Coordinates of C-alpha atoms in Angstrom, one line a residue:
Chain A
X766 CA 132.3 -184.0 14.2
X767 CA 132.7 -183.2 10.5
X768 CA 134.5 -179.9 11.0
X769 CA 138.1 -179.6 12.2
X770 CA 137.8 -175.9 13.3
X771 CA 134.8 -176.8 15.5
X772 CA 137.0 -179.4 17.2
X773 CA 139.8 -176.8 17.6
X774 CA 137.4 -174.3 19.2
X775 CA 136.0 -176.9 21.5
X776 CA 139.5 -178.0 22.6
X777 CA 140.6 -174.4 23.0
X778 CA 138.5 -173.6 26.1
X779 CA 138.9 -177.1 27.4
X780 CA 142.6 -176.6 28.1
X781 CA 142.7 -172.8 28.2
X782 CA 142.0 -172.6 32.0
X783 CA 144.5 -174.4 34.2
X784 CA 141.8 -175.0 36.8
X785 CA 141.5 -178.6 35.7
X786 CA 142.6 -180.9 38.5
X787 CA 141.0 -184.3 37.7
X788 CA 142.1 -185.0 34.1
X789 CA 141.9 -188.6 32.7
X790 CA 141.8 -188.2 28.9
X791 CA 144.9 -188.9 26.9
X792 CA 143.8 -189.3 23.2
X793 CA 142.2 -185.8 23.3
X794 CA 145.5 -184.2 24.4
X795 CA 147.4 -185.8 21.5
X796 CA 144.6 -184.8 19.1
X797 CA 144.7 -181.2 20.3
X798 CA 148.5 -181.1 20.0
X799 CA 148.4 -182.5 16.5
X800 CA 145.5 -180.3 15.3
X801 CA 147.0 -177.1 16.7
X802 CA 149.3 -177.2 13.6
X803 CA 146.1 -176.7 11.5
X804 CA 145.9 -173.2 13.0
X805 CA 147.2 -170.7 10.4
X806 CA 147.6 -167.7 12.7
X807 CA 151.3 -167.4 13.3
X808 CA 150.9 -164.6 15.9
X809 CA 148.3 -166.6 17.7
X810 CA 150.5 -169.7 17.5
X811 CA 153.3 -167.7 19.2
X812 CA 150.9 -166.4 21.8
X813 CA 149.8 -170.0 22.6
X814 CA 153.4 -171.2 22.6
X815 CA 154.2 -168.5 25.2
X816 CA 152.2 -170.4 27.8
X817 CA 151.9 -174.2 27.7
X818 CA 152.7 -177.3 29.7
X819 CA 155.5 -178.1 27.2
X820 CA 156.1 -181.8 28.0
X821 CA 159.3 -183.3 26.7
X822 CA 157.5 -185.6 24.3
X823 CA 155.1 -182.7 23.5
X824 CA 158.1 -180.4 23.0
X825 CA 159.7 -182.9 20.6
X826 CA 156.5 -183.3 18.7
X827 CA 156.1 -179.5 18.4
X828 CA 159.7 -179.1 17.2
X829 CA 159.1 -181.9 14.6
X830 CA 155.9 -180.2 13.4
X831 CA 157.6 -176.8 13.2
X832 CA 160.6 -178.2 11.3
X833 CA 158.4 -178.2 8.2
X834 CA 156.9 -174.9 9.1
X835 CA 158.7 -171.6 8.4
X836 CA 158.0 -170.1 11.9
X837 CA 161.6 -169.8 12.9
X838 CA 160.6 -167.5 15.8
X839 CA 158.4 -170.3 17.3
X840 CA 161.3 -172.8 17.0
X841 CA 163.7 -170.3 18.7
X842 CA 161.1 -169.8 21.5
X843 CA 160.8 -173.5 21.9
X844 CA 164.5 -173.9 22.1
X845 CA 164.7 -171.2 24.7
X846 CA 162.1 -173.0 26.7
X847 CA 164.1 -176.1 26.2
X848 CA 167.3 -174.4 27.4
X849 CA 169.0 -174.9 24.0
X850 CA 171.1 -171.7 23.8
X851 CA 173.0 -172.7 20.7
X852 CA 169.9 -173.9 18.9
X853 CA 168.1 -170.7 19.9
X854 CA 171.0 -168.6 18.6
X855 CA 171.1 -170.5 15.3
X856 CA 167.3 -170.1 14.9
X857 CA 167.5 -166.4 15.5
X858 CA 170.4 -166.1 13.0
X859 CA 168.4 -168.0 10.4
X860 CA 165.3 -165.8 11.0
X861 CA 167.4 -162.7 10.7
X862 CA 168.9 -164.0 7.4
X863 CA 165.5 -164.8 6.1
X864 CA 164.2 -161.4 7.0
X865 CA 167.2 -159.8 5.3
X866 CA 166.7 -161.9 2.1
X867 CA 163.0 -161.0 2.0
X868 CA 163.8 -157.3 2.5
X869 CA 160.4 -156.6 4.2
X870 CA 161.4 -156.2 7.9
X871 CA 161.3 -152.6 9.1
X872 CA 164.3 -150.7 10.5
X873 CA 162.6 -150.6 13.9
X874 CA 161.7 -154.3 13.6
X875 CA 165.3 -155.1 12.6
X876 CA 166.6 -153.2 15.6
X877 CA 164.2 -155.0 17.9
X878 CA 165.2 -158.4 16.5
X879 CA 168.9 -157.4 17.0
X880 CA 168.2 -156.4 20.6
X881 CA 166.4 -159.7 21.2
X882 CA 169.3 -161.7 19.7
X883 CA 171.8 -159.8 21.8
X884 CA 169.8 -160.5 24.9
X885 CA 169.6 -164.2 24.0
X886 CA 173.4 -164.3 23.4
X887 CA 174.0 -162.6 26.7
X888 CA 171.7 -165.1 28.4
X889 CA 174.0 -168.0 27.5
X890 CA 180.5 -170.7 26.8
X891 CA 178.7 -167.7 25.3
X892 CA 181.9 -166.5 23.7
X893 CA 181.8 -169.2 21.0
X894 CA 178.2 -168.3 20.2
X895 CA 179.0 -164.6 20.1
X896 CA 181.9 -165.3 17.7
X897 CA 179.7 -167.4 15.5
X898 CA 177.0 -164.7 15.4
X899 CA 179.6 -162.0 14.6
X900 CA 181.0 -164.2 11.8
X901 CA 177.5 -164.8 10.4
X902 CA 176.7 -161.1 10.5
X903 CA 180.0 -160.2 8.7
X904 CA 179.3 -162.8 6.0
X905 CA 175.8 -161.5 5.6
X906 CA 177.0 -157.9 5.3
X907 CA 179.7 -158.9 2.8
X908 CA 177.2 -160.9 0.7
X909 CA 174.5 -158.3 0.7
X910 CA 175.3 -155.4 -1.7
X911 CA 175.1 -151.8 -0.7
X912 CA 170.8 -150.3 1.7
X913 CA 171.6 -152.9 4.4
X914 CA 175.0 -151.4 5.1
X915 CA 173.5 -149.1 7.7
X916 CA 171.8 -152.1 9.4
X917 CA 175.0 -154.1 9.3
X918 CA 176.9 -151.1 10.9
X919 CA 174.2 -150.8 13.6
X920 CA 174.4 -154.5 14.3
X921 CA 178.2 -154.3 14.6
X922 CA 178.0 -151.4 17.0
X923 CA 175.4 -153.2 19.1
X924 CA 177.6 -156.3 19.2
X925 CA 180.6 -154.2 20.3
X926 CA 178.5 -152.5 23.0
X927 CA 177.3 -155.9 24.2
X928 CA 180.9 -157.3 24.3
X929 CA 182.0 -154.2 26.3
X930 CA 179.1 -154.6 28.7
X931 CA 179.8 -158.4 29.1
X932 CA 182.8 -157.7 31.4
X933 CA 186.1 -156.7 25.6
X934 CA 186.1 -159.1 28.5
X935 CA 189.9 -159.6 28.4
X936 CA 190.4 -163.1 26.9
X937 CA 186.9 -162.7 25.3
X938 CA 188.4 -159.7 23.5
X939 CA 191.2 -162.0 22.6
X940 CA 188.4 -164.3 21.4
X941 CA 187.3 -161.3 19.3
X942 CA 191.0 -161.2 18.2
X943 CA 190.5 -164.9 17.5
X944 CA 187.4 -163.7 15.5
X945 CA 189.9 -161.5 13.7
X946 CA 191.6 -164.8 12.8
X947 CA 188.3 -165.8 11.2
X948 CA 188.6 -162.4 9.5
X949 CA 191.8 -163.7 8.0
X950 CA 189.6 -166.6 6.8
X951 CA 187.3 -163.9 5.3
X952 CA 190.2 -162.0 3.9
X953 CA 188.0 -159.2 2.7
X954 CA 189.1 -155.9 1.2
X955 CA 191.2 -153.6 3.4
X956 CA 189.2 -150.5 2.3
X957 CA 185.9 -151.9 3.5
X958 CA 187.4 -152.9 6.9
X959 CA 189.0 -149.5 7.3
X960 CA 185.7 -147.7 6.5
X961 CA 183.8 -149.9 9.0
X962 CA 186.4 -149.2 11.7
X963 CA 186.2 -145.4 11.0
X964 CA 182.4 -145.5 11.1
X965 CA 182.5 -147.4 14.4
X966 CA 184.9 -144.9 15.9
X967 CA 182.9 -141.9 14.7
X968 CA 179.7 -143.5 16.1
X969 CA 181.4 -144.1 19.5
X970 CA 182.7 -140.5 19.6
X971 CA 179.2 -139.1 18.7
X972 CA 177.6 -141.3 21.4
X973 CA 180.1 -140.1 24.0
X974 CA 179.6 -136.5 23.0
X975 CA 176.0 -136.1 24.3
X976 CA 176.9 -137.7 27.7
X977 CA 178.9 -134.6 28.6
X978 CA 176.0 -132.3 27.9
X979 CA 173.6 -134.5 29.8
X980 CA 175.9 -134.6 32.8
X981 CA 176.3 -130.8 32.6
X982 CA 172.6 -130.3 32.6
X983 CA 172.1 -132.7 35.5
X984 CA 174.9 -131.0 37.5
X985 CA 173.4 -127.6 36.9
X986 CA 170.0 -128.8 38.2
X987 CA 171.6 -130.5 41.2
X988 CA 173.6 -127.3 42.1
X989 CA 170.5 -125.2 41.8
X990 CA 168.5 -127.6 44.0
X991 CA 171.4 -127.6 46.6
Chain B
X1412 CA 157.2 -128.9 35.6
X1413 CA 161.0 -128.5 35.4
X1414 CA 162.8 -129.3 32.1
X1415 CA 165.7 -131.3 33.6
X1416 CA 163.1 -133.6 35.3
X1417 CA 161.7 -134.4 31.8
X1418 CA 165.2 -134.8 30.3
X1419 CA 166.3 -137.2 33.1
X1420 CA 164.1 -140.1 32.0
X1421 CA 165.6 -139.9 28.5
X1422 CA 169.3 -140.6 27.7
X1423 CA 170.9 -143.5 29.6
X1424 CA 170.3 -145.9 26.6
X1425 CA 172.2 -144.9 23.5
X1426 CA 170.8 -147.7 21.2
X1427 CA 169.7 -146.5 17.8
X1428 CA 166.1 -146.1 19.1
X1429 CA 164.6 -143.8 16.4
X1430 CA 161.5 -143.4 18.5
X1431 CA 163.2 -142.3 21.7
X1432 CA 165.4 -139.6 20.2
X1433 CA 162.7 -138.6 17.8
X1434 CA 160.5 -137.8 20.8
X1435 CA 163.4 -136.0 22.5
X1436 CA 163.9 -133.9 19.3
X1437 CA 160.2 -133.1 19.2
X1438 CA 160.3 -132.1 22.9
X1439 CA 163.3 -129.8 22.3
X1440 CA 161.6 -128.3 19.2
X1441 CA 158.5 -127.5 21.2
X1442 CA 160.7 -126.1 24.0
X1443 CA 162.6 -123.8 21.6
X1444 CA 159.4 -122.9 19.7
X1445 CA 158.1 -120.3 22.1
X1446 CA 160.7 -119.3 24.7
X1447 CA 163.4 -120.6 27.1
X1448 CA 166.5 -120.1 24.8
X1449 CA 169.0 -121.9 26.9
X1450 CA 172.5 -121.8 25.3
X1451 CA 173.3 -125.5 26.0
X1452 CA 169.8 -126.8 25.0
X1453 CA 170.0 -125.5 21.4
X1454 CA 173.6 -127.0 21.2
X1455 CA 172.1 -130.3 22.2
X1456 CA 169.3 -129.6 19.6
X1457 CA 172.1 -129.7 17.0
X1458 CA 173.8 -132.8 18.3
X1459 CA 170.8 -135.0 18.1
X1460 CA 170.2 -133.5 14.7
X1461 CA 173.6 -134.8 13.7
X1462 CA 172.8 -138.1 15.4
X1463 CA 169.9 -138.6 13.0
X1464 CA 170.4 -138.6 9.2
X1465 CA 167.8 -135.8 8.7
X1466 CA 168.9 -132.6 6.9
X1467 CA 165.7 -130.6 6.6
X1468 CA 165.6 -130.3 10.3
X1469 CA 168.7 -128.1 10.3
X1470 CA 168.3 -125.6 7.4
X1471 CA 164.8 -124.7 8.6
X1472 CA 166.3 -123.8 11.9
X1473 CA 168.8 -121.5 10.1
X1474 CA 165.9 -120.1 7.9
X1475 CA 163.8 -118.9 10.9
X1476 CA 166.5 -118.0 13.4
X1477 CA 167.4 -114.3 14.0
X1478 CA 171.1 -113.3 14.1
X1479 CA 170.4 -111.9 17.6
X1480 CA 168.9 -115.2 18.8
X1481 CA 165.1 -115.0 18.1
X1482 CA 163.2 -117.9 16.7
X1483 CA 160.7 -116.5 14.3
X1484 CA 159.5 -117.0 10.7
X1485 CA 160.4 -114.7 7.9
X1486 CA 163.9 -114.2 6.5
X1487 CA 165.0 -110.5 6.9
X1488 CA 168.2 -108.5 6.6
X1489 CA 171.0 -108.6 9.2
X1490 CA 173.7 -106.3 10.3
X1491 CA 176.3 -107.7 8.0
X1492 CA 179.9 -106.3 8.4
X1493 CA 178.7 -104.6 11.6
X1494 CA 179.1 -105.0 15.3
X1495 CA 177.1 -108.2 15.1
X1496 CA 179.8 -109.5 12.7
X1497 CA 182.8 -107.7 14.1
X1498 CA 182.2 -106.5 17.7
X1499 CA 179.0 -108.0 19.2
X1500 CA 179.3 -111.7 20.2
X1501 CA 175.9 -112.6 21.7
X1502 CA 175.2 -116.2 22.6
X1503 CA 174.4 -119.3 20.5
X1504 CA 175.5 -122.9 20.0
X1505 CA 179.3 -123.4 20.2
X1506 CA 180.5 -123.3 16.6
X1507 CA 183.8 -125.0 17.2
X1508 CA 182.4 -128.2 18.7
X1509 CA 179.4 -128.2 16.3
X1510 CA 181.8 -127.7 13.3
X1511 CA 184.0 -130.5 14.5
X1512 CA 181.0 -132.8 15.0
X1513 CA 179.8 -132.0 11.5
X1514 CA 183.2 -132.5 10.0
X1515 CA 183.3 -135.9 11.7
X1516 CA 180.4 -137.0 9.4
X1517 CA 180.1 -136.5 5.6
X1518 CA 177.4 -133.8 5.9
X1519 CA 180.1 -131.1 5.7
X1520 CA 179.0 -130.2 2.2
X1521 CA 176.2 -128.0 3.6
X1522 CA 178.3 -126.9 6.6
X1523 CA 179.5 -124.0 4.4
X1524 CA 176.0 -122.7 4.5
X1525 CA 176.0 -123.0 8.3
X1526 CA 179.2 -121.1 8.6
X1527 CA 177.6 -117.9 7.2
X1528 CA 174.9 -117.9 9.9
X1529 CA 177.5 -118.2 12.7
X1530 CA 179.3 -114.9 13.5
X1531 CA 183.1 -114.4 13.9
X1532 CA 185.4 -117.1 12.2
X1533 CA 186.7 -114.5 9.8
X1534 CA 189.8 -116.5 9.1
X1535 CA 188.0 -119.9 9.4
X1536 CA 185.6 -119.3 6.5
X1537 CA 188.5 -119.3 4.0
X1538 CA 190.0 -122.4 5.5
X1539 CA 186.6 -124.2 5.4
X1540 CA 186.1 -123.1 1.8
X1541 CA 189.7 -123.8 0.6
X1542 CA 190.9 -126.9 2.4
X1543 CA 187.6 -128.7 2.8
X1544 CA 185.3 -127.5 0.0
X1545 CA 188.2 -127.3 -2.5
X1546 CA 187.2 -125.2 -5.5
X1547 CA 189.9 -122.6 -5.4
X1548 CA 187.8 -120.3 -7.7
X1549 CA 185.2 -120.1 -4.9
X1550 CA 187.8 -119.3 -2.3
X1551 CA 189.3 -116.6 -4.5
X1552 CA 185.8 -115.1 -5.0
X1553 CA 185.2 -115.2 -1.3
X1554 CA 188.6 -113.5 -0.7
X1555 CA 187.5 -110.8 -3.2
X1556 CA 184.2 -110.5 -1.3
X1557 CA 185.9 -110.2 2.0
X1558 CA 185.5 -107.3 4.4
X1559 CA 187.1 -103.8 4.3
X1560 CA 190.9 -103.3 3.9
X1561 CA 191.3 -104.1 7.6
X1562 CA 190.6 -107.7 6.6
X1563 CA 194.2 -108.4 5.5
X1564 CA 195.1 -111.1 8.0
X1565 CA 193.7 -113.9 5.8
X1566 CA 195.8 -112.9 2.9
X1567 CA 199.0 -112.7 5.0
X1568 CA 198.1 -116.1 6.4
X1569 CA 197.1 -118.1 3.2
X1570 CA 198.9 -116.3 0.3
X1571 CA 201.3 -119.1 -0.1
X1572 CA 198.5 -121.7 -0.4
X1573 CA 196.4 -119.4 -2.6
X1574 CA 199.3 -118.8 -5.1
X1575 CA 199.5 -122.5 -6.0
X1576 CA 196.3 -123.1 -7.9
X1577 CA 195.6 -119.9 -9.8
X1578 CA 198.6 -117.5 -9.5
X1579 CA 197.3 -115.1 -12.1
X1580 CA 194.2 -114.2 -10.1
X1581 CA 196.2 -114.3 -6.9
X1582 CA 198.8 -112.0 -8.5
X1583 CA 196.2 -109.6 -9.6
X1584 CA 194.6 -109.5 -6.2
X1585 CA 197.9 -109.0 -4.5
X1586 CA 198.8 -106.2 -6.9
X1587 CA 195.4 -104.5 -6.2
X1588 CA 195.8 -104.9 -2.4
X1589 CA 199.4 -103.5 -2.4
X1590 CA 198.7 -100.7 -4.9
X1591 CA 196.1 -99.0 -2.7
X1592 CA 193.1 -100.4 -4.6
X1593 CA 191.3 -101.5 -1.4
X1594 CA 187.8 -100.8 -2.7
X1595 CA 185.1 -103.3 -1.7
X1596 CA 183.1 -105.6 -4.0
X1597 CA 179.7 -107.2 -4.3
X1598 CA 179.0 -110.6 -2.6
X1599 CA 176.7 -113.3 -3.9
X1600 CA 176.1 -117.1 -3.6
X1601 CA 199.2 -120.7 -19.4
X1602 CA 200.3 -117.1 -20.1
Chain C
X1478 CA 222.3 -124.5 5.1
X1479 CA 220.6 -127.3 7.1
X1480 CA 220.6 -125.6 10.5
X1481 CA 220.9 -121.9 9.7
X1482 CA 217.8 -122.0 7.5
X1483 CA 215.8 -123.9 10.2
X1484 CA 216.8 -121.3 12.8
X1485 CA 215.9 -118.4 10.5
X1486 CA 212.5 -119.9 9.7
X1487 CA 211.9 -120.5 13.4
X1488 CA 212.8 -116.9 14.1
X1489 CA 210.6 -115.8 11.2
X1490 CA 207.4 -117.3 12.6
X1491 CA 207.1 -119.8 9.7
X1492 CA 206.9 -123.0 11.7
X1493 CA 205.1 -124.9 8.9
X1494 CA 207.8 -124.2 6.3
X1495 CA 210.5 -125.0 8.8
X1496 CA 208.9 -128.4 9.7
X1497 CA 208.4 -129.2 6.0
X1498 CA 212.1 -128.4 5.3
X1499 CA 213.2 -130.5 8.3
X1500 CA 211.1 -133.4 7.1
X1501 CA 212.6 -133.0 3.6
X1502 CA 216.1 -132.9 5.1
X1503 CA 215.5 -136.1 7.2
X1504 CA 216.1 -134.1 10.4
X1505 CA 213.6 -136.1 12.5
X1506 CA 215.4 -135.4 15.8
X1507 CA 215.5 -131.6 15.2
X1508 CA 211.8 -131.6 14.0
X1509 CA 210.8 -133.6 17.1
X1510 CA 212.7 -131.2 19.4
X1511 CA 211.1 -128.2 17.6
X1512 CA 207.6 -129.8 18.0
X1513 CA 208.1 -130.6 21.7
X1514 CA 209.5 -127.0 22.2
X1515 CA 206.3 -125.4 20.9
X1516 CA 206.2 -122.5 23.4
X1517 CA 203.7 -120.7 21.2
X1518 CA 200.2 -122.1 21.6
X1519 CA 197.4 -121.9 19.0
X1520 CA 194.8 -124.1 20.7
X1521 CA 196.9 -127.1 19.7
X1522 CA 195.2 -127.0 16.3
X1523 CA 198.4 -126.0 14.6
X1524 CA 200.2 -128.4 16.9
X1525 CA 197.8 -131.2 15.9
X1526 CA 198.4 -130.4 12.2
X1527 CA 202.2 -130.4 12.7
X1528 CA 202.0 -133.7 14.6
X1529 CA 199.8 -135.3 11.9
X1530 CA 202.3 -134.1 9.2
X1531 CA 205.2 -135.5 11.2
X1532 CA 203.5 -138.9 11.7
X1533 CA 202.6 -139.0 8.0
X1534 CA 206.2 -138.3 7.1
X1535 CA 207.4 -141.0 9.5
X1536 CA 204.7 -143.5 8.3
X1537 CA 205.3 -145.4 5.1
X1538 CA 208.9 -144.1 5.0
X1539 CA 211.0 -147.3 5.8
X1540 CA 210.5 -150.9 6.7
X1541 CA 207.9 -151.7 9.4
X1542 CA 210.3 -153.7 11.6
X1543 CA 209.0 -153.2 15.1
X1544 CA 205.8 -151.6 13.7
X1545 CA 203.9 -152.1 17.0
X1546 CA 206.8 -150.8 19.0
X1547 CA 207.3 -147.8 16.7
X1548 CA 203.6 -146.9 16.8
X1549 CA 203.5 -147.2 20.6
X1550 CA 206.6 -145.0 20.9
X1551 CA 205.1 -142.4 18.5
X1552 CA 201.8 -142.4 20.4
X1553 CA 203.7 -142.0 23.7
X1554 CA 205.8 -139.1 22.4
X1555 CA 202.7 -137.4 21.0
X1556 CA 201.8 -136.5 24.6
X1557 CA 198.0 -137.1 24.5
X1558 CA 197.5 -136.1 20.9
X1559 CA 197.0 -137.8 17.5
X1560 CA 195.0 -140.7 18.7
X1561 CA 194.9 -144.1 16.9
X1562 CA 191.7 -142.9 15.1
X1563 CA 193.7 -140.2 13.2
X1564 CA 196.5 -142.7 12.3
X1565 CA 193.9 -145.2 11.1
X1566 CA 193.3 -143.3 7.8
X1567 CA 197.0 -143.3 7.0
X1568 CA 197.5 -147.0 8.0
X1569 CA 197.3 -148.0 4.3
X1570 CA 197.5 -151.8 3.8
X1571 CA 199.4 -154.0 6.3
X1572 CA 199.1 -157.0 8.6
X1573 CA 199.5 -155.3 12.0
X1574 CA 196.2 -156.8 13.3
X1575 CA 197.5 -157.4 16.8
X1576 CA 198.5 -153.8 17.5
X1577 CA 195.2 -152.4 16.1
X1578 CA 193.2 -154.9 18.1
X1579 CA 195.0 -153.9 21.3
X1580 CA 194.5 -150.2 20.6
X1581 CA 190.8 -150.8 19.9
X1582 CA 190.4 -152.9 23.1
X1583 CA 192.1 -150.1 25.1
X1584 CA 189.8 -147.5 23.6
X1585 CA 186.7 -149.6 24.2
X1586 CA 187.7 -150.2 27.8
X1587 CA 188.2 -146.4 28.3
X1588 CA 184.8 -145.7 26.7
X1589 CA 183.1 -148.3 28.9
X1590 CA 184.8 -146.8 32.0
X1591 CA 183.7 -143.3 31.0
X1592 CA 180.1 -144.5 30.4
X1593 CA 180.0 -146.3 33.8
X1594 CA 181.3 -143.2 35.5
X1595 CA 178.7 -141.0 33.7
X1596 CA 175.9 -143.4 34.8
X1597 CA 177.1 -143.5 38.4
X1598 CA 177.3 -139.7 38.4
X1599 CA 173.7 -139.5 37.0
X1600 CA 172.4 -142.0 39.6
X1601 CA 174.2 -140.0 42.4
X1602 CA 172.7 -136.7 41.1
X1603 CA 169.2 -138.3 41.0
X1604 CA 169.6 -139.6 44.5
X1605 CA 170.8 -136.3 45.8
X1606 CA 167.9 -134.5 44.1
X1607 CA 165.4 -136.9 45.6
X1608 CA 166.9 -136.4 49.1
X1609 CA 166.9 -132.7 48.7
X1610 CA 163.3 -132.7 47.6
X1611 CA 162.3 -134.9 50.5
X1612 CA 164.1 -132.7 53.0
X1613 CA 162.5 -129.6 51.5
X1614 CA 159.0 -131.2 51.7
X1615 CA 159.6 -132.3 55.3
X1616 CA 160.8 -128.8 56.3
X1617 CA 157.5 -127.3 55.3
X1618 CA 155.0 -126.7 58.1
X1619 CA 157.3 -128.3 60.7
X1620 CA 158.7 -125.1 62.2
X1621 CA 157.5 -125.8 65.8
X1622 CA 159.6 -122.9 67.1
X1623 CA 158.7 -121.9 70.7
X1624 CA 158.6 -118.5 72.6
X1625 CA 160.0 -118.4 76.2
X1626 CA 158.1 -117.1 79.2
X1627 CA 159.0 -113.4 78.6
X1628 CA 161.4 -112.7 75.7
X1629 CA 163.4 -109.9 74.0
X1630 CA 166.6 -109.1 72.1
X1631 CA 168.5 -106.3 70.2
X1632 CA 165.9 -103.6 71.0
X1633 CA 165.9 -104.6 74.7
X1634 CA 162.5 -103.2 75.6
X1635 CA 160.1 -106.2 75.0
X1636 CA 159.5 -108.7 72.2
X1637 CA 155.7 -108.7 72.5
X1638 CA 155.0 -105.0 71.7
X1639 CA 155.6 -104.6 68.0
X1640 CA 156.0 -107.9 66.0
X1641 CA 157.5 -111.4 66.2
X1642 CA 160.3 -111.5 63.6
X1643 CA 161.9 -114.6 65.1
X1644 CA 164.9 -116.6 63.7
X1645 CA 166.4 -120.0 64.7
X1646 CA 169.0 -120.4 67.4
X1647 CA 166.9 -118.2 69.7
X1648 CA 166.9 -114.7 68.4
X1649 CA 164.2 -112.0 68.5
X1650 CA 163.6 -108.8 66.6
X1651 CA 160.9 -106.0 66.4
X1652 CA 160.7 -105.8 62.6
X1653 CA 162.1 -102.3 63.3
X1654 CA 165.5 -102.8 65.0
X1655 CA 166.4 -105.2 62.2
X1656 CA 165.5 -102.6 59.5
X1657 CA 167.5 -100.1 61.5
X1658 CA 170.5 -102.4 61.5
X1659 CA 170.6 -102.9 57.7
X1660 CA 170.3 -99.2 57.1

């Protein structure tokens, strides 16, 4: 057929339904895998990658094809499907850095990406990955001039909350102290670190403030019901 | 339905979540728009306002809030230097906790405006203006625009601090106070 | 006079000036004793200010030496006041990373414990409310109270002549004897 998109559409419904039981073709599967790269819809590419057979050779071919592509999210998803926690974390960090450099991701989108990255880190020897992610975030915050300072502070607060919910974690907090050793590697200005610590403490106090009011309202309602 | 039932599904998660607390703030705004003036609720209405970086969501509340605790549009006169300012206490958001929370952030510049709306705090207004807001000329003017001669505790409490910046004006004020010249004054906002 | 002036200032209700003079005179022990002997209470606000001033005078005064030990001793003597957050602004520039990290870890652990307790309390309150609502719903239209063959109480005459104001635990009233009792 002298039209690639017609072949793509024909092969779409061929493998869309898993009802196939007697499959004998092999060249067609490879052709479909190779020509799926011709699809320019990144969102549809991610949707297709959400559900697939994902053979080991097929996974390797998909990773090789996506190496040239800029779809870092697809690579991270493939790594997660491949149980590559470190690779997925690295891909997520690279995607976050690219979004920050572009300066087009929304605040809500940035928060969603940070939440997804925190969930992926918690999924995973995860202490080393968390330390590396914290170091990368600190380096990105330092390199980026002050706009993204609020985003960096929010990311730091989210990382602290995740570390607290992991158990600080005792020695993991010492790992954070070991991360402080990497801070000695950074050797940043004392004023910036003091300001960041003060902001974190103020945010923690503000977050804890509303819990008392919520508990008081709940207790009043419970007493009235009783 | 009951309010706490609605509030229960919120909270729990304290992630930045602009949508969640935006919806909570809208629900509280609609609740306070018509009736149900629970003392705690409005306090929470302030806290979430401090949680967000919005500013116009606070002054508008001050603009259309009655001194006696009625939410209605139209700025009108109030019983200044009266029972509402000296004897009557009424009910509203806890100023001390709210003031501390505001001072925690850097939004304390407009807090001086919020101090006027809140009653009492006769000796706290000078402290907020002098220590925090600096500008000793403004503090001296406020002390001149203070209440009737019965309002002498602030002078006896902060004369030592006042006499460091501008002794001449402080000396004149002290001489006027001690010489029987206790007449009031209008209020507005090297020798 | 080092001591006479301090005593006169204390008797003159000028504790701020007395504390400043004691700090200028390097009478740390006397100032600490005066602070701990604060019989007068001003909602701890004046006490907090005095403690902050004393800490600032102590801080950046001599060599750090046992900086972590000195900071821990000061915090312990503060008696649940002047937390590490307040001392952070006056920390200036130093290399006491370990003590600050330990304090931050302790604060984070306390905050996590408080959040867990709040969540547990909220869950318990929700469960109690659900149980109360279920009990109230079940109690509706399930009275199933019974009248005995012949019945009466309080009035004595007969239950079935005026009305059937009946209570649990087997009591009967005429709707008139009860209103007579309350009067």
